[PDB]
Amino acid sequence: AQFKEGEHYQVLKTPASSSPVVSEFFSFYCPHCNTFEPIIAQLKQQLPEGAKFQKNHVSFMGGNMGQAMSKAYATMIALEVEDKMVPVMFNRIHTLRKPPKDEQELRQIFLDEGIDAAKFDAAYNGFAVDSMVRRFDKQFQDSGLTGVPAVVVNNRYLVQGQSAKSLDEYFDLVNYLLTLK
Template identity: 40%
Template sequence: MKFLFAALLLLASQLSFASDSFMQDEHYQLLATPPSPNAQVVEYFSYYCPFCYNFEPIVAELKKALPAGTPLHKVPVAFLGGNMAATVQRAHATAGLLNIEDAFTAALFNQIHQQRKPPQNRSDITKLFASIGVEQVQLDAHFDSLPVNSLVTEYDDAVAAANIRSVPSFVVNNKYLVNISAVSSQQQFNALVNYLLSLPAEAETK
């Protein structure tokens, strides 16, 4: 029992040290945006970004490490993807409304980075949706709808408010921008995000 207690104390001290070692302006930046009403993590990304594609397994592990009930939202940016960027944003929003975002994300990343066949037009997007079970009539009913328009506007507004200039970028509670270049492992990444989730809405600078 003594050994178990000592081990627990050691673990607690290590976890405390890990949290204390995260420093503002080194591991994260404090944004001038209002905090989100509820805990959340947002990944700003582009389907055309190879780093974002390679980050997918890391994001999957991060999701598992988040506190129960804490969502991780994916927000596609419009500054990558050329003339297809806006269409892909709209497609992502549509997939979310149809509750098939995960399937759509996997399919589009695969088509762009594995098959090397990025979509060139709306028809290609329609074919992609068909490959994951969405018929054209269902897609057309949502693609240009008001809810999708609103989501795309929210994407662009959020990117502008957080001054996102590179992807992938992760923002916690709409207040803390993670510096992923300062992270050296999955464990450290998970710990940093969870540390930021624990901070007050208006953190004091360190």
């Protein structure tokens, strides 16, 4: 057992899920965090079909505009454009290095990516989006996370992954946490 609690991960004692689920917490405002996100996607493809995966965006990393960034990811969901724009937010941050300063620049980013201001406006003001921004923010609070990217397995074990220099070891910890209760 290469992985053990207190060394490869810690237990939040949070409300664990009845089935295997993995959630990633990240912020569009951290170029280094955004770079790790991709690695989490590698875990998704590697994750066992039995295990479920989930995504979480934190507004506390954003700061004064954290609330806007959370709504923006939810807005993508209304437009079915999460996969496309999601990385656009990380690119613009981790690559263009031009993070949105207001909701206005944020609107231009979506339209630049081929999305409409009309449908994006319907999504940003959709009651569903606002509900999702609150949802993920709660996930980080219960998870006891102090900085993304953070990975939670069964919403109860937190992956340190420090020992795993290579995804093979980091992935293996996630696999055990999926079976941890």
